[PDB]
């Protein structure tokens, strides 16, 4: 009599954020980091996007943190350009994840 969809599960998370500059060295070597083995990237100069999976790990916040050694973690909740998951991180991590229900 009535009929319903659900799609709570992993797909494809959109990560978009601001560019500046050695994100490509740097987006190979966080890539490296997590077992990525089928994601595709979309850096087109002004912004920097990506498409992994959705269940992914990353542990590269240093090469994060260096990028910018001289300065905070605000600058990261700011270089935010658009998104289409979740993200977690953590004392020196970022982890995103596409699950809605957590």
């Known amino acids: ?8 599960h992993n797909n494809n998370v959109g990560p978009i954020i ?3 500059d050695l994100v490509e ?14 994601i595709t990237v979309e850096d087109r100069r002004a912004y920097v996007r990506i498409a992994a999976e959705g269940e992914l790990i990353l542990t590269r916040k240093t090469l ?4 910018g050694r001289p300065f905070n973690m605000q600058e990261l909740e700011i270089n935010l350009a658009s998104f289409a998951g979740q993200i977690q ?14």
């Open 1 to 8: 009599s009535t009929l319903a969809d659900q799609a709570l």
């Open 25 to 38: 060295p740097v987006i190979e070597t966080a890539e490296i980091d997590n077992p990525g083995k089928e």
């Open 89 to 102: 991180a953590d004392e020196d991590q970022i982890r995103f994840y596409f699950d809605k229900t957590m």
């Open 18 to 20: 601001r560019a500046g």
């Open 64 to 67: 994060e943190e260096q990028l």
